[PDB]
Design a protein around this ligand. Structure first.
Ligand SMILES: CCCCCCCCCCCCCCCCCC(=O)OC[C@H](COP(=O)(O)OCCN)OC(=O)CCCCCCCCCCCCCCCCC
Ligand SMILES: CCCCCCCCCCCCCCCCCC(=O)OC[C@H](COP(=O)(O)OCCN)OC(=O)CCCCCCCCCCCCCCCCC
Ligand SMILES: CCCCCCCCCCCCCCCCCCCC
Ligand SMILES: CCCCCCCCCCCCCCCCCCCC
Ligand code: SF4
Lengths: 169, 101, 162, 143, 309
């Protein structure tokens, strides 16, 4: 499989990083109170809310305080793209200024959607290659171009025929 | 110069050396591996700790030989402890040890 | 028991030599704690077990904590002396070092020529020191308490905030 | 006669008044340029804190200390005599979504989700006064 | 090269290193137990891998030596204070005649971890918070030693095995109940445990000294913290609850059972008893616990000299 810019220990390191993930939950807006550690110790940043223009610098600074390796999960349509607030005071997506590894649609997403995002991030971490040391070898991060989730789940989604009618609970 | 005392000395040396070496080597492994990208009441309480720790060391020396010193040593240490408690009560009452005035 | 004494004495000498010729107060106090640990190792090598125990419990564990505490409270960050560093220019330190070397050689000449059977290193335990302390040294203990009380009163009277 | 007429919703370095009819509602192009300026003034805010750009007074008496504190995220500037609060001003506008401007840019029907997202714990409680006022406009009596 | 003094010294070296590895692994296991109760070993290994391979970052405006030295102190102080504890007959690391005095040296050195971390963390709030924390730990180390001195008076010597042997008939929890509770309070205060977890929570001009510690130095702080309460629990056992002495079970089994019981009790009073104020902590310490230790030592001396025919 393709990647984007002696071997078993790399899988060991990936397994250690994958099973041990410490989040920093950014409050921001109502995606946070749906879904419910200093940034120095946390390695995953969960942006859950509208990226307002007055606190885009706060998000950028608290992202810059984290240490490599670092991953970003964007919950909610606001953090994905701006959502419904295509308005003057709202940044249209947190991926305008920080790199995002997993996106979850929803307004808000369910907590189980965040669990699914955690599983997706865990697979992404497990299938990537990072430098072991900063003195030996290539000092480049190899992200894997994984198969998209909407094309992976296309067969069972298209195969759906009948649903329950909305007149009952 | 028995074998038990030299065995315990070498065991204690190995314990200290392996412990400090484990901490240092694990810090070295952490640093080497992985890629890259005021108020005066504080002085008062530290001073009181120093003074009361020296009087504590006097009681440290007393406690290991209570049997051998007899009742006279008990009277001397009781005078010592009463002076210590008088100083402590003085500090408490005149507001030296009251953190929120 | 002799190799430990010589290596701890060498560590203590080098540590205080670094102490008196350093500019950062926290580094000076750290090397001073290192020398205090070395001198406690010297005490344990000589069998004075209680002396080394009180060296690390009190001298390197209470007094130097107070020195570090004051250093952090006053926050010395180069207050017109770290930028000057007079003790490195020779005109400030050669004279006092010459005087100290003369006093050292006089004291060392006094030390040598004195009869010496050697130090046995037999452990003088803390219970013997406690027996002597509350035996033939009663007034020393009581008025050491009185002295520490005096130090408490004077240090409170000077150093309180108000 | 206002004691301190400063911006409360927008940042102080904001051009224009967003609820005017000639101000465009939609989001302009993002810039890392302005983003790094706003980051660098947020880094140097404690160094260059001037306590009359906030309505404060007697700024450094000189026993008084100015801090900033971190149900939503907002800042409040605190003026302290030791541990006692002498004055405080809460810095709001970090959660400004331009909902009233969206009211001028959605149809009467399609503005309802925006009414939900004001006071997000409320849901239908926030839905209710909007549809009641629209039904007053529409001449509707509901069964 | 076969001789039984060499065999004996290698067996004692093996005993010491076995004790050390068991202590560090039990500390890591307690860290996971507190994280879970409030494969498991696989998750701890994965955590250790994450802390190994995350970049260890030192602030540019911070002293490297002090910042690197503070977690080493926080680990090695009580990790070396364990070395006097006898876990079984013939399974003691060092039979020092100073014993709990050596433990007191290690506690006095352990306060330097908090002081050094607060100074090297180049922040005014972190400095103030760590200075409050060091003030509290001094205010409880002022009576930790005397709370042990009651038991030293009863046993008559500083040696650990002598204290355990004097605990043959009656454990010193029953006569020295006040010494026991003061030692428990001071031990729970020295290692920065609940109630006295974060003294900087009472004031917003102060911040934690664990902040700016990231990755493996933070792991050093964490594992040293739990190792410190390992050895505090073990010392409490060997000073008040017979050590390894019991009626039926083997001595190591009894010592392990007592140590594990105090481990879960420390977890429990983390989980249960709430937060007092900082001035309440200072006042309680300096106005109750030290005079309690002094009066308990006087009563212990009077009882000992009364029961001396
Ligand atoms: C090696 C070269 C230098 C390397 C860098 C520095 C490392 C530390 C060096 C000093 C400490 C270790 C010295 C070697 C000790 C080895 C053990 C030994 O010699 O034991 C002898 C003796 C045993 O006791 P005893 O019963 O009196 O002996 C009778 C013999 N049947 O023992 C005694 O009587 C007491 C032994 C000394 C006291 C205990 C240890 C004190 C440690 C002080 C450390 C100070 C800080 C050092 C920092 C270094 C880095 C900056
Ligand atoms: C980065 C490194 C910084 C420095 C780290 C420490 C340096 C030294 C490490 C190597 C030590 C080598 C071994 C030392 C000797 C061990 C054995 C020993 O101490 O034996 C002497 C004595 C024996 O007593 P016993 O057997 O009961 O009686 C027999 C009758 N003589 O027993 C005694 O006298 C016991 C009392 C001495 C115990 C010394 C313990 C270590 C003290 C230093 C702690 C440092 C903590 C970390 C750094 C703090 C900040 C700088
Ligand atoms: C061996 C049995 C003795 C029983 C009687 C003990 C009490 C009588 C003698 C007491 C002597 C006390 C001396 C204390 C001196 C304190 C000096 C303080 C100076 C400030
Ligand atoms: C939390 C407990 C920490 C204990 C640290 C020391 C462990 C030492 C283990 C020694 C095992 C052998 C003890 C002597 C034999 C008696 C028991 C035999 C069955 C294990
Ligand atoms: S996506 Fe929806 S639920 Fe999430 S912060 Fe935006 S408005 Fe709130």
């Amino acid at each position: 499989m393709d990647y984007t810019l002696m071997g078993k220990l790399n899988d060991m390191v990936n397994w250690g990083r994958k099973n041990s993930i410490w989040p920093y939950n950014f409050g921001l807006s109502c995606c946070y109170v749906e879904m419910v550690a200093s940034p120095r110790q946390a390695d995953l940043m969960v942006v859950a809310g509208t990226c307002f223009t007055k606190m885009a610098p706060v998000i950028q600074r608290l992202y810059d305080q984290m240490l490599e390796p670092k991953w970003v999960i964007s919950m909610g349509a606001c953090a994905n793209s701006g959502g419904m607030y295509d308005i003057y005071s709202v940044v249209q997506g947190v991926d305008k200024f920080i790199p995002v590894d997993v996106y979850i649609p929803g307004c808000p997403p369910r907590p189980e959607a965040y669990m699914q995002a955690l599983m997706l991030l865990q697979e992404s971490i497990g299938k990537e290659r990072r430098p072991l040391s900063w003195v030996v070898g290539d000092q480049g991060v190899y992200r894997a171009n994984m198969q998209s989730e909407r094309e992976r789940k296309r067969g069972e989604r298209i195969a759906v025929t009948n649903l329950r009618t909305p007149d009952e609970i | 110069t028995s074998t038990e005392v030299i065995a315990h000395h070498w065991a204690f040396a190995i314990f200290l050396i392996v412990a400090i070496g484990l901490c240092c080597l694990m810090l070295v492994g952490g640093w080497f591996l992985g890629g890259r990208a005021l108020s005066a009441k504080f002085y008062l309480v530290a001073m009181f700790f120093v003074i009361f720790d020296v009087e504590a060391l006097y009681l440290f020396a007393w406690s290991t030989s209570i049997r051998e010193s007899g009742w006279v040593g008990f009277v001397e240490a009781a005078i010592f402890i009463f002076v210590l408690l008088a100083g402590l009560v003085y500090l408490v009452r005149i507001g030296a040890l009251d953190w929120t005035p | 028991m002799e190799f430990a004494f010589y290596i701890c004495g060498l560590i203590a000498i080098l540590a205080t030599l670094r102490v008196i010729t350093h500019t950062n107060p926290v580094h000076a106090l750290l090397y001073l704690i290192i020398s205090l640990l070395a001198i406690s190792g010297v005490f344990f090598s000589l069998g004075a077990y209680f002396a080394g125990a009180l060296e690390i419990i009190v001298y390197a564990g209470a007094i130097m904590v107070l020195f570090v505490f004051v250093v952090m409270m006053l926050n010395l960050g180069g207050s017109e002396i770290e930028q000057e560093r007079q003790w490195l220019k020779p005109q400030v330190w050669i004279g006092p070092a010459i005087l100290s070397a003369i006093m050292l050689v006089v004291i060392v000449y006094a030390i040598l020529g004195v009869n010496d059977q050697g130090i046995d290193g037999t452990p003088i335990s803390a219970k013997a020191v406690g027996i002597t302390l509350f035996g033939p040294y009663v007034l020393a203990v009581e008025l050491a308490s009185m002295l520490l009380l005096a130090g408490l009163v004077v240090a409170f009277h000077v150093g309180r905030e108000e | 006669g206002h004691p301190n007429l400063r911006r409360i919703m927008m940042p102080q370095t904001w051009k224009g008044h967003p609820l005017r009819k000639d101000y465009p509602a939609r989001a302009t192009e993002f810039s890392p340029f302005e983003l790094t300026k706003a980051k660098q003034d947020l880094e140097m805010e404690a160094l260059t804190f001037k306590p009359e750009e906030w309505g404060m007074k007697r700024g450094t008496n000189e026993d008084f200390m100015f801090l900033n504190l971190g149900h939503g995220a907002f800042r409040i500037v605190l003026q302290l005599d030791g541990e006692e609060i002498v004055d405080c001003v809460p810095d709001i506008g970090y959660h400004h979504r331009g909902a009233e401007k969206m009211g001028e840019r959605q149809s009467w029907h399609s503005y309802i989700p925006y009414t939900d997202r004001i006071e997000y714990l409320g849901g239908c409680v926030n839905e209710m006064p909007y549809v009641l006022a629209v039904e007053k406009l529409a001449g509707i009596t509901v069964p | 090269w076969i001789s039984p003094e060499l065999i004996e010294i290698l067996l004692t070296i093996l005993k010491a290193v076995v004790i050390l590895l068991v202590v560090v692994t039990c500390g890591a296991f307690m860290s996971f137990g507190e994280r879970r109760l409030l494969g498991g070993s696989l998750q701890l290994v994965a955590d250790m891998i994450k802390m190994f391979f995350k970049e260890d970052w030192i602030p540019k405006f911070s002293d490297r030596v002090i910042f690197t030295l503070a977690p080493m102190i926080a680990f090695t102080s009580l990790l070396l204070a364990f070395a006097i504890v006898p876990v079984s007959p013939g399974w003691v690391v060092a039979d020092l005649n100073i014993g709990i005095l050596f433990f007191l040296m290690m506690a006095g050195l352990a306060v330097y971890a908090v002081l050094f971390a607060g100074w090297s963390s180049n922040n005014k709030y972190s400095l103030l918070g760590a200075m409050r924390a060091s003030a509290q730990t001094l205010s409880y180390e002022v009576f930790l030693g005397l709370s042990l001195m009651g038991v030293v008076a009863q046993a008559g010597s500083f040696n650990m095995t002598d204290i355990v042997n004097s605990q043959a008939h009656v454990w010193n929890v029953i006569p020295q109940f006040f010494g026991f509770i003061t030692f428990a309070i001071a031990g729970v205060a020295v290692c920065h445990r609940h109630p006295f977890d974060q003294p900087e929570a009472e004031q917003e001009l102060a911040d934690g000294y664990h902040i700016e510690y990231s990755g493996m130095k933070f792991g050093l702080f964490f594992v040293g913290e739990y190792i410190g309460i390992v050895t505090i629990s073990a010392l409490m056992v060997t000073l008040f609850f017979g050590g390894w002495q019991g009626p039926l079970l083997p001595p190591f089994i009894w010592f392990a059972l007592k140590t594990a019981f105090f481990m879960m009790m420390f977890i429990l009073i983390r989980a249960s008893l709430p937060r007092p104020r900082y001035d309440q902590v200072m006042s309680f310490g300096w106005k109750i616990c030290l005079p309690l230790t002094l009066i308990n030592l006087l009563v212990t001396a009077a009882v000992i000299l009364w029961q001396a025919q």
